[PDB]
Amino acid sequence: VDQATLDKLEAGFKKLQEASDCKSLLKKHLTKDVFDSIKNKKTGMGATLLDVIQSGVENLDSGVGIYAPDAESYRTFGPLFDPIIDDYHGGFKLTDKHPPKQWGDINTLVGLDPAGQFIISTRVRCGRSLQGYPFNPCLTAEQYKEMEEKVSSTLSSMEDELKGTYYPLTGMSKATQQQLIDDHFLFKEGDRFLQTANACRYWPTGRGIFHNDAKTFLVWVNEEDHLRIISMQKGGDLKTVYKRLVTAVDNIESKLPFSHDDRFGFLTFCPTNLGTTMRASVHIQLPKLAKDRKVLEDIASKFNLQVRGTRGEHTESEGGVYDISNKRRLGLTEYQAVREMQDGILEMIKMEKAAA
Template sequence: MSSATNEKLKQCNMCHTVCGKGKVPEEVVQELDDAFECLESSPIMSLLKKHLNKNVFDELKDLITPYGSTLWDCIKSGVVNLDSGVGIYAPDAQAYHVFDILFDNIIEDYHNGFKYTDKQPLPDWGKVSTLQNLDPLGRYVVSTRVRCGRSLEGYPFNPKMKEDDYVAVEKKVTNALRELKGDLKGVYYPLADMSPEVQKKLTTDHLLFKEGDKYLEAADANHYWPVGRGIFLNNENTFMVWVNEEDHVRIISMNEGGNLPKVYSRLVEAVRQIEKRLAFARSVRLGYLTFCPTNLGTTIRASVHIKLPNLGKDTEELELVADEFHLQVRGTGGEHTEVKDGIYDVSNKRRIGLTEYEAVKEMHDGVLELIKREQEFGVVKK
């Protein structure tokens, strides 16, 4: 056993248990060997393939977390879906510790140089008054949304959750949500009891998540569906909480138009109220812990649906602005979807290594610049 592996067999500050010990089943070892060969022979370059070299593979393939998660649980989705951009998930919080030599390299690559020696700043929501309405005349921004993800302490993530875990998490979360005050007050709708008509309407209105994502399916994140899943909605449909979708909790604030300060302040108030009632998994180094490593740190995703009919014709210019302000640009149907009618989903890409306010401010500044370029592009091309 190498010194690096020995280093894994120590008390983990995420769970206060010994990580790395355990016997990986022989059939899983075979799955891993086959998976590595599959990745090696694939022409597609995900972050998983880029960073899972033979040395790293040999170092990690015999390790296991206290919840029984192996390297196969982490990389399965990226092997089944070779078109993945990232290709790795954490089946439980301790996986970030046990398989850190792989996760750390992927995190550094995706999150613009967040190194294994770096630490996530303490939560800081900043001053809402320093943000502005992105589009007060309503010409460009169709809607604004800010969300964050949370995982409850004491439970694994989706791939390792039992049916009882889903039920227990749902009960704890919904009990907390019933205590929300003001315009956050609402009703919880369990997915298991939802009529097909209501489910279709909520999905069409971009309020409700749905089963069927092939990346989550391959990561074993859809067990016992729809047990323990549901949506909490306030009366105005401007605030909602997803329960046991990708993460245990997704807290979401939204509005039509570009009034970012209003949307952001609602989210901040919701998080503060919920955190008084629930304990969430957080690492000193990685911040709030989530199923997907792209969401670590603040877990903040601040986004707009924005009309860019002129700038959208110049993808190079659009990409330049996106790179400058660390923006992610994709279709309005979500990740891996096409752009329709010149409307883009634009969000902050960085979530770790900066504060909650700084993550939102990057989207704020980037969208203002996109609107400026859209206006200039239209004038020049006339």
């Protein structure tokens, strides 16, 4: 680690201390001891502590504030990652290891809202990293192009329900891009948390989206993770949505090598996405319970759920529509993660019906 970087870290640490109302896990867990213990360390790819905490230093409204530039970072900077990961995922000890992949019995999942008055749409995503490629901040432009080639070529072999077409962001019309984002299908462009993590270099080179014609099965290429594999549709038929995701991921896994860690399960760029990498969500209206989004969030938290705005994290609810999902992804199985959403949403709906 050089001097210019040390200077910036000391100043960043200072900034976090002075931000009396900053509530990120970065601020909470980057103690002086922790800070001093790892600030002079560097990975084989040259990732430093600055590359890890910079997004959280610059964006004090971060909930977490850190990312892993490469896989090594998770251990090189363990003293910071470890407490943050344990905290976010609701208990995960130094000696704990994420369980083996287990989709569980899909037939035990139910329709989340049969009368159709609360839930708008249901979505399940996972993320994967390609073996042999580091995370965004360590990628070159050429690697983005190489990965895009590997993934798009693989997805051309999908068949039946999953058969579809790859659409590069490069050459994509502004109108087509904006509509896909508005309809909740395509990742947004220009995220300040990702940008400051240097996760968006060379944009839009290598970025794009694959989907079947119905857009119930989608794969994001080279956004936050190398792949995000998504199943979604209108309504509350979680069983179908989840079954389609399982089929797609099992099939893609036989073709592409993805990075998996004995302790952290599937590796991802953000520590919140480790393990199952799974975020199962609904877009839902709960007018009585949502009469104050902070009350809504307090209720959700007891069910281990997270509340986001309509256009994703770091956005507001529009027209009473909230994104509610399992928060935890690591230290529980895929089945357990999706069941936390199912169970929590079914009960929150019951509470809404009962509320005055």
